[PDB]
Amino acid sequence: SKTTLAARILTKPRSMTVYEGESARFSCDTDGEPVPTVTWLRKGQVLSTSARHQVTTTKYKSTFEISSVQASDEGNYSVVVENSEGKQEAEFTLTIQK
């Protein structure tokens, strides 16, 4: 991840289903030279703490946990991890029933 790599997904995040933001935590390990980038987006306003979601990013691994959703965040959400010259993602769906 610092000489000739791109952007790929090693351990994408899984999906989940709850009533709202109970405890659906996620973690996707993505590499990228020199450092990869994560972006959770699908339709609920690029996920990333847009109003009721809580995402975070580390060195080469991001993590998304929903615990503040309101009542209209459906279930499909994704994460396009891109780097200095790559562009992959991880599609999953965190649904809610409230």
**Burial class for 36, CB neighbours closer than 10 Å (0-12, 13-18, 19+):** buried
Q: What is the CATH number of domain 1-98?
A: 2.60.40.10
Count of residues making up the chain:
98
Instruction: Name the pairing type of β-strands 88-96 and 16-18.
Output: parallel
Taking the CA atoms of 28, 97, 43 and 91 in sequence, report the sign of the dihedral they define.
Answer: positive
Strand partners for 27 = 63
Q: What method did the depositors use to determine the structure?
A: NMR
Find where tokens 């946990």 sit.
65
Q: Where are the domains of the chain?
A: 1-98
Q: Helix, strand, coil % (nearest 5) of the chain?
A: 0, 45, 55
CB atoms within 10 A of CB 31: 20
- Give the C-alpha distances (Å, rounded to integers) separating 95 from 5, 29, 74, 85, 89: 34, 22, 5, 32, 19
Token pair belonging to 70: 């309101």
Asked if 68 and 48 touch (Cβ cutoff 8 Å), the reply is: no
- Give the C-alpha distances (Å, rounded to integers) separating 24 from 37, 49, 69: 22, 15, 11
Asked if 96 and 75 touch (Cβ cutoff 8 Å), the reply is: yes
In angstroms, the CA 43 to CA 98 distance is 18
